[PDB]
């Protein structure tokens, strides 16, 4: 993969909104969203968040992420990490996490990145572990069926 990045643009939204393939996937990247996902929901997230970024390969938007918390001199918390179905497992999420870590260090002078991952998302837990994140706490949350799920709160020092 040769990947590049840029700020998300309006033109990208229909593409990104296409990424979650089912209710679970949507929940694991955007738990406040309601299925079906839509550009309006995505745009509403972008408006209340920062650092909405896309990753591009061979002319295709393949990844998206942003921050849902940002505290200058302190930390940022990664949100909305989404990858195109055809590009899963090819390093897009790793690439984007690295871009977002740089953004957190550079723009927000953060010392820490926080990532919170739902317990069912084994691939996410394993990837963030590979990238140097450690688990710090587990919180109870509820899924759309009202079932209890565990949110694994991980973090990583940035420099």
Residues lying near ligand C04 in the complex (CB under 6 A)? 11, 14-15, 18, 29-32, 68, 79-80, 116, 141-142, 151
- The residue with tokens 């991980």 is 154
Q: How far is the CB of 89 from ligand C04 (least distance, A)?
A: 18
Half-sphere exposure of 145 (CA within 13 A, CB side): 5
Nearer to ligand C04, 11 or 59 (CB): 11
Strands (E), the chain: 4-7, 50-57, 60-71, 75-83, 112-118, 134-142, 148-157
CB of 5 or CB of 79, closer to ligand C04: 79
Q: Is 142 assigned a ligand-binding role in the annotation?
A: yes
Helix (H, G, I), strand (E, B) or coil at 19: coil
Q: Would you say 121 is a known binding-site residue?
A: yes
Whether the Cβ atoms of residue 56 and residue 4 lie closer than 8 Å to each other: yes
| 123 assigned binding-site residue | no
Q: Is 93 among the annotated ligand-binding positions?
A: yes
CB of 136 to ligand C04, least distance (A): 14
Looking at beta carbons, which residue is closest to ligand C04? 79
Least distance from C-beta 98 to ligand C04, angstroms? 18
**Comparison of 14 and 106: residue with beta carbon closer to ligand C04:** 14
Is 61 marked within a binding site?
no
CB-neighbour burial class of residue 20 (10 A; exposed 0-12, middle 13-18, buried 19+): buried
Q: Residues comprising the binding site for acetyl-CoA?
A: 81, 83, 89, 91, 93-94, 121, 126
């Amino acid at each position: 993969m040769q990947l590049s990045h840029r700020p998300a643009e309006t033109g990208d939204l229909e593409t990104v909104a296409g990424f979650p393939q089912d209710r679970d996937e949507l929940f694991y990247c955007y738990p406040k969203a309601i299925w079906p996902f839509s550009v309006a929901q995505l745009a509403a997230a972008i408006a209340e968040r920062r650092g909405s970024t896309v990753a591009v390969h061979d002319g295709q938007v393949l990844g998206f992420a942003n921050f849902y918390q940002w505290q200058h001199g302190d930390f940022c918390a990664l949100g909305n990490m989404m990858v195109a179905p055809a590009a899963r497992g090819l390093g897009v999420a790793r690439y984007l996490i690295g871009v977002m870590e740089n953004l957190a260090r550079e723009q927000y002078k953060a010392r820490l990145m926080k990532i919170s991952c739902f317990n069912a998302n084994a691939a996410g837990l394993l990837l963030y572990t590979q990238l140097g994140y450690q688990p710090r706490a587990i919180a109870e949350r509820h899924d759309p069926d009202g079932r209890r799920v565990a949110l694994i709160q991980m973090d990583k020092p940035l420099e």
